[PDB]
Write a protein that binds this ligand. Sequence first.
Ligand SMILES: Cc1cccc(CNCCS(=O)(=O)O)c1
Length: 658
Amino acid sequence: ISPIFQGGSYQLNNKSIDISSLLLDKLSGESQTVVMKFKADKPNSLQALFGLSNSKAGFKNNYFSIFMRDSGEIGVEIRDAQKGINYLFSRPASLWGKHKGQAVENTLVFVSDSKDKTYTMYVNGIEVFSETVDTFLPISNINGIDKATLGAVNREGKEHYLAKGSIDEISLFNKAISDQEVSTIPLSNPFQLIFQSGDSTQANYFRIPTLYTLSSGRVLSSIDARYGGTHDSKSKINIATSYSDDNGKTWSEPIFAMKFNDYEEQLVYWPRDNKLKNSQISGSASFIDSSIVEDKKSGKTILLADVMPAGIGNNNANKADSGFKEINGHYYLKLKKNGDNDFRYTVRENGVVYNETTNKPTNYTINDKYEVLEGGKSLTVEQYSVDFDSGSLRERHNGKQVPMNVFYKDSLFKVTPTNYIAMTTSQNRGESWEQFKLLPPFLGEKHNGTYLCPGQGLALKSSNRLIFATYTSGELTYLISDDSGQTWKKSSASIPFKNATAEAQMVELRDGVIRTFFRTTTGKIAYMTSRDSGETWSKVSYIDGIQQTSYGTQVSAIKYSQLIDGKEAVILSTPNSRSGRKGGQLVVGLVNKEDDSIDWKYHYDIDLPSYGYAYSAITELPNHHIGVLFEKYDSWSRNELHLSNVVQYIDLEINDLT
Ligand SMILES: Cc1cccc(CNCCS(=O)(=O)O)c1
């Protein structure tokens, strides 16, 4: 259908534009669609892009508006005082501001549908809200409407919510266009989605992106596929992967590298209201925090992730037990059988479940998949599904049986409720993944395991050494293998922090010289250096010129392959901010060969200082461009939980950065 109104090249410089004569007498019926292509690289704190209002005295709360905040939030108000209706819908972190230093044209599609009593907002190809009401209010049917306005809302004859930006195109339709029709509206996105709502994972949310370039040129990515909102475990979370064989231009339909089946994989819209947003899937096993490395010698790709048994996360992680028992200098996974008050069982060699009280083996064994078998026959449990239909979250048996896994809540045998580390491999560069194995304890029997640093592992260029960084209280604990990850050893490196979330990433500055950048509690990114390929580690220093928050955020890093201003180059990706997770930057450092110090010379703003930027992953693509996959929102803020499609991918070239 044609538009009833179509206009453009409107400059909003804190002066509203009156289009009432053009538009108001065209509006008819109760369903409308607004399509609007706009820029705002210097928004005011709070501004309206489009307004429909009763401007008369005493009717200040009769208007429709499409508004944004300088935090990147978008929303609408639909108010009529006489009808006693005051509707506000919005979603934080829905906008782009800048890309490569040019203002981004955001494509906004708002559908006001009177038949379905539903308001739907799309921005840059992403539905950010869809709200159904019991009492629909057509944006046209607001009492006494007499003004149509761009860049403000006219209330009692005055400009409210004055805007700074521009509207390249605006069109209105006296129809609620279909989801199908919306999909055909052309976009001007600076970004790409690799993982997204409705893909093969069926997770509505995603966190903790990774990126790694394989020697064949294939680019690999892993991520937390988060089902129960964006909450850290406890929840249901699988690890998913996707690859690109064309320098990041297109990406495979994702598959799982790590998954549990105790709970169904469900696409669920998690409540964002204050009473309910902290609802948590509370009985599901899960993974969290993946890290990737490629082993030159075997050609295998290796992926590690944290593992958590049902119910269990960071809060209630057994911080006094590794979950293994030492016997004769060997480690065995402890088990608790349904009905005991203690862990009276171990998984010895060949999965054989073994009674520790009697030292007699049982008729039960554990297969490669951590599944339970009795006399060689495989036991099952009934799966759970979740729903908010009763008003609050319910976790209910769903009728489907799945193999009994010792990480599950309904399992006859259960592991110790603490965090573990799992490892899987792919022989086909991420077209499929093996069953994972648990890594052994490194810090000992009574020490609960370390925490994987998400992102990349490090493959030393001049040898077969593989290193995965992990953290725990008071130290980083690097995991080192020289035999394609068959066996691992630890290299501990003390840090001056207790209970720090010390997510660390490494770059190889030259052959045998590793620098690790890590998150702290001080507001500065820290670093340490190894010169013997990770055997031993320097004292901690800190970077000046970049700010993080007191709680800090993960930082991603690569050694760039090409000299810049004639010097070795490292690239860092991080929020640059002491207030929140925003102001994303790539920072380019030039190495000083006389002392391996780094001059941080170029700062590249991914988008506005006020727009969200959290965890990230960077990689040098085979064409020497830079790929960035990142949380484009504040993943710390309690106001920005459970947003869909905010992990986004962009392509940069070095000259953009400098
Ligand atoms: C439950 C859990 C397991 C392993 C690691 C973590 C850390 N979560 C950090 C993410 S953030 O800084 O809170 O955004 C949590």
